[PDB]
Amino acid sequence: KISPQLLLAAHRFLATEVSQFSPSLISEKILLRLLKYPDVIQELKFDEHNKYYARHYLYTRNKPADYFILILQGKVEVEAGKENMKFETGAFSYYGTMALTSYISDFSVRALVDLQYIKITRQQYQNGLLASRMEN
């Protein structure tokens, strides 16, 4: 289970250091409502026997994805490139930011270790923006 300190810090960092989620674009109370919505936080269990599997890919190469994810915990790698280069990244690295706007994914995000991430859909994002336009 994710601790409240991690969730709140993810709210802070996500609000300030990410373009689409800035408090002017989406109000703070409604960002918390969007994070608190069910299925926004998802946990993945790593299978050691089958390291490469369809479940381990959070983003698949050249296939569509409509949502933005910010990784709170675990270790992950990105396989994207023309040469198929691979980089290792860790907690609080966000992927799929412009997929929220009105997306074939060139980047491949695969789970290296047990990770805990948040998934924010384009529908959730735009609807949350509309609710943010409500006085708040």
Residue numbers in the entry: 545 to 646, 694 to 727
What did the original publication write about this model?
The Cyclin and CBS domain divalent metal cation transport mediators (CNNMs) are the most recently identified proteins involved in magnesium cation (Mg2+) transport across the cell membranes. The four known members (CNNM1 to CNNM4) encoded in the human genome are integral membrane proteins with strong homology to CorC, a bacterial magnesium/cobalt efflux protein. Structurally, the CNNMs are complex multidomain proteins that consist of four independent domains connected by linkers of different length. The intracellular region is directly attached by a long α-helix (H0) and comprises two distinct domains, a Bateman module and a cyclic nucleotide monophosphate binding-like domain (cNMP domain).
